[PDB]
Amino acid sequence: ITGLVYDQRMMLHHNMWDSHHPELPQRISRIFSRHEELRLLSRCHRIPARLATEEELALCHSSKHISIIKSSEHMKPRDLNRLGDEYNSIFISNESYTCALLAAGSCFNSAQAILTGQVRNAVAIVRPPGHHAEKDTACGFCFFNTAALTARYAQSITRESLRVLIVDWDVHHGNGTQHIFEEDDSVLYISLHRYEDGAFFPNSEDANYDKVGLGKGRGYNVNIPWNGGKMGDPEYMAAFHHLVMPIAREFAPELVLVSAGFDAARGDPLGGFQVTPEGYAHLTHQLMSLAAGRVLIILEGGYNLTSISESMSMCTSMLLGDSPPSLTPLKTSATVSINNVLRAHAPFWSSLR
Numbered sequence: 001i002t003g004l005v006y007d008q009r010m011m012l013h014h015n016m017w018d019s020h021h022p023e024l025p026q027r028i029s030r031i032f033s034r035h036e037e038l039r040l041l042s043r044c045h046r047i048p049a050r051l052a053t054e055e056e057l058a059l060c061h062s063s064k065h066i067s068i069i070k071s072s073e074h075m076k077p078r079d080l081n082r083l084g085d086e087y088n089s090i091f092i093s094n095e096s097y098t099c100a101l102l103a104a105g106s107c108f109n110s111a112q113a114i115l116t117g118q119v120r121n122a123v124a125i126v127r128p129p130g131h132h133a134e135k136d137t138a139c140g141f142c143f144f145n146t147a148a149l150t151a152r153y154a155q156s157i158t159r160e161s162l163r164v165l166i167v168d169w170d171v172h173h174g175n176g177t178q179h180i181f182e183e184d185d186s187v188l189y190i191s192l193h194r195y196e197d198g199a200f201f202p203n204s205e206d207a208n209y210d211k212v213g214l215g216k217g218r219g220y221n222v223n224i225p226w227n228g229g230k231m232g233d234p235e236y237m238a239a240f241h242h243l244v245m246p247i248a249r250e251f252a253p254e255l256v257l258v259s260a261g262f263d264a265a266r267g268d269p270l271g272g273f274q275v276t277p278e279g280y281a282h283l284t285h286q287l288m289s290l291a292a293g294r295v296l297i298i299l300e301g302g303y304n305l306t307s308i309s310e311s312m313s314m315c316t317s318m319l320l321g322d323s324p325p326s327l328t329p330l331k332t333s334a335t336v337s338i339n340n341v342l343r344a345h346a347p348f349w350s351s352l353r
């Protein structure tokens, strides 16, 4: 059984100054309508959304950050603009805090459904996204770190050191997720992302391959940075083959969360990559071999409405047990990237030797 969570109320978060801003309310309604069209929706167990509580938010966020975001609820447009502008790439409306709570609470109910054994795996069609949000700050369309929160939520109902793998295949680095877990050996963070030697958002060397984790978390942060323009299925499949899956198997996660942005998709105007719906299906299918199939796919970014609809629906079809669809040599710089990661992580993972 595959679970699915979607709630129309998460459409209420909007940019009142620019209704064409790419992080659109209709990102989630289009993905949901596509699951209906492909007859995937009726094959899933529907999990209800709920609000995250402030206590749950404190699993990862400071009380000052929660408080500041919550206060936005009762702001006039001018102050919404001023507050959003204190962050990098944030717009806020009166509904934003509520929607951020719903995105987190939806993922919690999904992780609970998996861990109580109501469902084997699940998909969360949620917004606003999460992975740029830091303990103390909002960033990059993200208010609270939904995936990071979900990992802590899962630990709070099982065991504190429950081994959680987060695979972040959004085209951007999840700086917030990396930082939250940087000293933590219970949460393995693996990100693939466009880097371009720092020219690609969020423009920090924190995304480079030599950032391997700190203290007891050393070896538990795996950055796979792409340089040198468009990448697609071959490069993604090669990174999963050489790096993601051997490290993951060695870690032996008890729960997999996917920070599943679909902005590395063919057609995305922000990502500039060419990962196909069939590619994402193969990535999902591989991750399903981990943690006895306990996989929660969480929407992050992805801005071409058709691309994200087809791609996320393909992932759900895999979680449901459908056969992987049918699938070149790698761009030279992709080989260089993979080999850099391998060199950086060989000291920590015997499977890479």
Ligand SMILES: CN1C(=O)N2Cc3c(c4cc(OCCN5CCOCC5)ccc4n3Cc3ccc(C(=O)NO)cc3)[C@@](C)(C2)C1=O
Pocket (backbone or CB within 6 Å): 022, 089, 140, 141, 170, 171, 172, 200, 201, 261, 263, 269, 270, 271, 300, 301, 302
């Ligand atoms: C690549 N790239 C970027 O990532 N940098 C951040 C950025 C960019 C950008 C451009 C935008 O409008 C361009 C005009 N047109 C839009 C329609 O298409 C045609 C162009 C709007 C928001 C923007 N943001 C903010 C942002 C974007 C994605 C995530 C996300 O998914 N992370 O997981 C997080 C934050 C920039 C300039 C820089 C940028 O170009």
Ligand SMILES: [K+]
Pocket (backbone or CB within 6 Å): 168, 169, 170, 171, 172, 173, 174, 191, 192, 193
């Ligand atoms: K990523």
Ligand SMILES: [K+]
Pocket (backbone or CB within 6 Å): 181, 182, 183, 184, 185, 187, 188, 189, 213, 217, 220, 221
């Ligand atoms: K970590």
Ligand SMILES: [Zn+2]
Pocket (backbone or CB within 6 Å): 170, 171, 172, 261, 263, 300, 301, 302
């Ligand atoms: Zn992104």
